[PDB]
From a paper:
[name] is a saprotrophic bacterium which possesses the remarkable ability to grow in isolation using a variety of hemicellulosic polysaccharides as sole carbon sources. It produces a diverse collection of GHs, assembling enzyme systems that can degrade cellulose, xylans, mannans, and xyloglucans, among others. Effective xyloglucan-degrading GH systems (recently reviewed by Attia and Brumer) contain exo-acting glycosidases acting as debranching accessory enzymes and endo-acting enzymes (xyloglucanases) that generate short, branched β-(1,4)-glucan oligomers (xyloglucan oligosaccharides).18−23Exo-acting enzymes are expected to address each of the glycosidic linkages reported in xyloglucan branches, though the reported enzyme diversity falls short of reported branch diversity. The work presented here comprises the design and validation of trisaccharidic xyloglucan (“XyG”)-type cyclophellitol probes and their validation as bona fide, predictive tools for the identification of xyloglucanase activities and their discrimination from cellulase activities within a xyloglucan-elicited [name] degradome.
To determine the molecular basis for the reactivity of ABP-XyG-Cy5 with [name] but not CjCel5C, we crystallized both enzymes and solved their structures by molecular replacement in both unliganded and ABP-bound forms. In contrast, [name] recognizes ABP-XyG-N3 with (−83°, 133°) torsion angles. The consequent twist in the glucose backbone positions the α-(1,6)-xylose residue above W28 and W33, forming a hydrogen bond between O4 and D64. Notably, the active site cleft of [name] is significantly more open beyond the −2 subsite, so we hypothesized that cellulase-specificity in [name] is dictated primarily by an inability to accommodate α-(1,6)-xylose residues in the positive subsites. [name] showed a ∼14-fold preference for 4MU-GGGG over 4MU-XXXG, roughly in line with its sevenfold preference for ABP-Cel-N3 over ABP-XyG-N3 but highly divergent from its 3000-fold specificity toward carboxymethyl cellulose (CMC) over xyloglucan, supporting our hypothesis. Measurements of irreversible inhibition kinetics showed strong selectivity of Cel5C for ABP-Cel-N3 over ABP-XyG-N3 and only weak selectivity of [name] for ABP-Cel-N3 over ABP-XyG-N3, matching in-gel fluorescence results. Pulldowns from saturation cultures using ABP-βGlc-Bio, ABP-Cel-Bio, and ABP-XyG-Bio unambiguously identified Cel5D as the only exclusively ABP-XyG-Bio-reactive band, Cel5C as the exclusively ABP-Cel-Bio-reactive band, and Cel3A, Cel3B, and Cel3D as the ABP-βGlc-reactive bands. The secreted ABP-Cel- and ABP-XyG-reactive band in the arabinoxylan secretome (the intense band in Figure 3A, last lane) was identified as [name].
Numbering used by the authors: 1 to 298
Write the structure that this text describes.
Amino acid sequence: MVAPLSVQGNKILANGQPASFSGMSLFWSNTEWGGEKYYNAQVVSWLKSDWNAKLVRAAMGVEDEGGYLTDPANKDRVTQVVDAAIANDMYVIIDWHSHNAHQYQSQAIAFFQEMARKYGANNHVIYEIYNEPLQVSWSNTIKPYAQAVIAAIRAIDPDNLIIVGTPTWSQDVDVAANDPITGYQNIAYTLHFYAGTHGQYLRDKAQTALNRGIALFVTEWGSVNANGDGAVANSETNAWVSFMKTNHISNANWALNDKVEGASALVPGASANGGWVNSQLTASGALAKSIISGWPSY
């Protein structure tokens, strides 16, 4: 058992105090996308014991090739991680990893209903219903999808956090803050930043959203470019880390994966079952492990 998370204004609370949790996003769960081998109990317990992670995100592909809509095996991999997180007293994000979730609303509702029924009683579970909306209306496209999916979760699970994607690849948290979801408790809003691409401009939008009284949750962030490749931006990453520690913002680094790209935490061939020596981390993985392991415990 872990502390139940709630939202009060711009804070996520645990044990009656602002609290924040640091860990890794798994890569896309999709069949033959390469991330899938890391969807297992051994990776989850290694992240806890070696990285001191208190958070793992299962990034379940939806309408993209080899995703949940065409290969239900995606959900078996989510189940493995969620079960493992619960066994290790770690928070787990169930991420509907779509850029167009509002086009697959019925499928989203059915999936979150199933996840709520199975896992709703565990305080570990965090629902993320819409990874990264594109350049679409908050009020007219995202919010009504959010309302429909939240209603369905909340009929089954009245408490557990629901994180809602925001416009422009989950950047426009200031926009969401101007028309928040008020109808349901324990709703927080997605912020995504890639330190090779995003600095103070996006932090200012985040500050505006916090000032307007909504809670943020960085379910995905990178130390490299927005496209998941490029050099590690150490200085900008540290600026984001200070911002997130100051505002008690939970964070999952993209990505626990071995693909040849800057965002991968692991060198190609890093064991599917964990145990990685530090020399089998990339610059991004070494920076992500230093951030997660150093995260305030509260």
